[PDB]
């Protein structure tokens, strides 16, 4: 996030870090319940990748985080690699997450909800803070 | 060039499809929602992450970090996957797996 600020530790409990074999963060995701994470289809997540929950600092060693393995990956069949439309993939964890104060779920809207233009929302992540 | 160790957050406004198309044109498809273009920008490593808006006092996943300015311009619209357009697919997947 370019021009964002540091979040309060544990304040966005659904935010997860998607890492690969080497533990390299390549994408983020959101917990919608204890066993499902919604991410982007272009991230190219596999069963070999690991979902990390309850995290804030990645250079840390003390945080009680949960490194949950992925058992199933479900990329939206309608995902278009050229238009990038339907850019959503669902992850089912092999081992379910243990909810706490720093690990919980985000609400999902109804297909009929209208979040009008102008609405200030929030985006979170460990992405580049400067291109 | 700077990747953070600590989680970052950023407030950003939702944009109309029309307003967004004024820049991205026909690239903006039905399952996409634009936000940003206001001084902040999601960037490499943010993909898959959440774009939340608090519906009824609770943070609701309205968007998923997808694509945008290749240089992460804080002045161009950021494109996120529209969850309202994908929510039923989500539900249907949970209900069958």
């Amino acid at each position: 996030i370019v021009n964002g600020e540091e979040a309060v530790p544990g304040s966005w409990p659904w935010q997860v870090s998607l890492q690969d074999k080497t533990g390299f963060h390549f994408c983020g995701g959101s917990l919608i319940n204890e066993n499902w994470v919604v991410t982007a289809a272009h991230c190219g997540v596999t069963t070999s990748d690991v979902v990390v929950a309850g995290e804030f600092d990645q250079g840390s060693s003390s945080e009680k985080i949960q490194k949950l393995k992925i058992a199933k990956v479900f990329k939206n069949s309608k995902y278009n690699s050229l238009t990038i439309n339907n850019d959503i993939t669902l992850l089912k964890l092999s081992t379910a997450a243990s909810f706490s104060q720093t690990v919980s779920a985000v609400c999902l809207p109804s297909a009929s909800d209208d979040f009008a233009a102008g609405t200030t929302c929030v985006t979170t992540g460990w992405g580049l803070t400067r291109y | 060039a700077n990747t953070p160790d600590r989680l970052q957050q950023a407030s950003l406004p939702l944009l109309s499809n029309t307003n967004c198309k004024k820049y991205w044109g026909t690239k903006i498809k039905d399952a996409m929602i634009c936000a940003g273009a206001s001084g902040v920008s999601s960037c490499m490593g943010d993909s898959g992450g959440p774009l939340v808006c608090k519906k009824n006092g609770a943070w609701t996943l309205v968007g998923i970090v997808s694509w945008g300015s290749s240089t992460c311009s804080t002045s161009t619209p950021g494109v996120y996957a529209r969850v309202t357009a994908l929510v039923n697919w989500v539900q249907q997947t949970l209900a069958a797996n």
């Binding site: 544990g10 304040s11 966005w12 706490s100 104060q101 919980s104 985000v106 | 957050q9 407030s11 609770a58």
Partner: peptide, 11 residues
């Protein structure tokens, strides 16, 4: 869902 135990503070 959507109500963090640890409240997020924007700005």
């Amino acid at each position: 869902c959507g109500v963090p135990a640890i409240q997020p503070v924007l700005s």
